[PDB]
């Protein structure tokens, strides 16, 4: 059974045993939009739950447009050219318009990344700046939620007369789905906010997980925080496995987002009849699989269909390596995941990116992990609570020998962009 797993910029061609392997779990077919940019134009004229963007923008003196950073494969020019043309038609000059990269707590985008994200012409024609989550002085305090999270949001967005956000609706291991409100919290929120919102009091709950909005405390809270900042207009898209846009939603930050989620829920779920002992997955290739930090998403994404004590085999290119210095420091400070969890469950201290180690700890309570990558040497991966294995085919052979002849293999080529589920019926 030959399959191409997502892997860096290339894919990875794997051959899995026919007798042991279930049919691959894939996004359901939906027709790509032939001309998604023209659809964005139409949706800006007739949006969901808001005035047309042209009428909203007229008389506004300044605009701030939130865009995702490199880790999200948003086809930004498709969304931005319509927005920028409408703002021009509304009378805003280009100098009135700021594009703000909603990094969350990620490192800033590089000059080359801005070109990759936005296109060269857009990137040199409008001001493009990065959010810095550890610079509290660049944020404005908006209040504290009923659950005690202070809302600190980037001042360039707070001060803008017209607030716009763009993004991509995909499953997310903490917030259920990306998009909508998440461009604000945490996209332009300070560590003072994010350290609490990404704390164990949120992440240890079972529905802080892929595909859950209802019942997910993470989503309740980032929606509440985004409502405190406000957002006048969003444009969000969904993408199929080949990265073609399959839907566009525009308008009210909540109503448009929920319509996009309703769409993605019709295609993202891939069901199996029972969990299996071996799950082969990816980190969705470039650009998500740049770091081990992000590749944890492939591991959490596989959890619903792995049996307790099973093995997840993941392939990810890891072209940028492990991730932030702070994320890397946690492995040095806590040799075992149990000890790491004891430390963070005390709430005495907060470290940038600790939330992803908390998610890796959740994976490792349920499953072994075999990790296939050339971006990081085996000795380095072995210190990150995964077993480096030279090839996916070898890793699967090893797991099948360990579990015995009844074991089955599932495979998820697009990794965390699929929502695998067990349907016992
Ligand atoms: C979601 S919890 C999230 C977390 C971070 C952290 O650093 S923590 C960063 N981001 C970035 O915010 C933008 C919007 O997120 P979405 O999940 O794509 O809707 C995007 O640039 C993310 O990289 C998000
Ligand atoms: Ni986050």
Residue numbers in the entry: 2 to 426
Please share excerpts from the published article on this structure:
To address this problem, we applied a heating-cooling treatment to promote ligand exchange. In the heating step, the purified protein was incubated with a non-D-lactate substrate at approximately 3 mM at 55 °C for 15 min. In this step, the increased dynamics of the protein at the elevated temperature leads to the opening of the active site to the solvent, allowing the release of the bound D-lactate and the binding of the alternative substrate to the active site. In the cooling step, the temperature was changed rapidly to 4 °C in a thermal cycler, followed by incubation on ice to lock the conformation in the most stable state. It should be noted that D/L-2HB was used in the ligand exchange experiment but only the D-enantiomer was found to be bound in the active site. The two D-substrates adopt the same orientation as D-lactate and interact with the same set of residues in the active site. Importantly, the aliphatic substituents on Cα of all three substrates point to the same space that is defined by Leu174, Met175, Trp356, and Gln357. In both structures, the amide group in the side chain of Gln357 in Conformation A moves away from the substrate by approximately 0.4 Å, and Conformation B leaves more space to accommodate the substrates with a larger Cα substituent. This result indicates that Gln357 exclusively confers the plasticity of the active site. The geometry and the hydrophobic nature of the substrate binding pocket defined by these residues, as well as the flexibility of Gln357, explained the negative correlation between the size and polarity of the Cα substituents and the reactivity of the substrates.
